Amino acid sequence: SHMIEIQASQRAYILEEMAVQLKKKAEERFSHDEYKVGRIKLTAGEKVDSEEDIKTISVYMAPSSVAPVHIDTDHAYVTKEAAEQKEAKQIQTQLADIWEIGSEKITVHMEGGESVGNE
């Protein structure tokens, strides 16, 4: 049903090791929570020797729980967005702290919602 493909790569192996250890450590703070860490996507460049070499980290946060026509006051609408922006940025900082890695490298995708983190 669910089949994957990989290309042999030392460099990728290391990167997948850093990735499961990062996944686990996140799952510790978001186990019993609103949000569940789901996909995590790392990118890296020519050399892959430590965490330092990770260029980016995408995180897809899970719901852990149709109306075409919505109608809103102007005020309802902007504040509804403000809060979702503000939720997204908090998972960003939380993971920044947890992983001891600058939030510039972390994109948070808020699936089960409509938001994203920085770039």
Side-chain angles (χ1 to χ4, degrees):
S1 306
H2 29 281
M3 40 285 299
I4 70 185
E5 156 169 277
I6 67 140
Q7 155 159 358
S9 203
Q10 176 95 238
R11 264 186 277 248
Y13 152 73
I14 287 161
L15 196 55
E16 281 277 5
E17 161 186 327
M18 281 183 326
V20 300
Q21 270 151 31
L22 281 179
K23 184 156 70 173
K24 258 149 227 178
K25 214 76 168 189
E27 262 153 30
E28 276 199 315
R29 273 46 161 195
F30 300 74
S31 208
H32 33 286
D33 280 48
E34 181 150 41
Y35 279 169
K36 223 253 171 198
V37 316
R39 283 168 303 289
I40 297 179
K41 296 198 252 140
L42 283 66
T43 83
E46 190 112 337
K47 313 273 80 207
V48 183
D49 269 33
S50 72
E51 272 167 74
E52 272 75 12
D53 292 290
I54 292 173
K55 288 223 181 164
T56 72
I57 313 173
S58 275
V59 192
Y60 295 79
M61 283 322 282
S64 98
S65 270
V66 54
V69 182
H70 205 47
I71 299 208
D72 291 359
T73 43
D74 294 48
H75 148 273
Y77 176 84
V78 50
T79 57
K80 221 175 249 194
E81 177 70 13
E84 276 154 25
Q85 208 63 15
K86 150 82 177 52
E87 173 80 282
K89 203 156 256 147
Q90 186 224 22
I91 302 150
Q92 193 189 58
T93 46
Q94 247 192 275
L95 302 158
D97 287 344
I98 296 168
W99 286 333
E100 306 204 276
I101 287 153
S103 66
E104 79 257 46
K105 287 185 187 178
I106 310 174
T107 309
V108 175
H109 292 283
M110 248 325 305
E111 252 303 21
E114 291 194 356
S115 238
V116 288
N118 261 54
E119 74 247 8

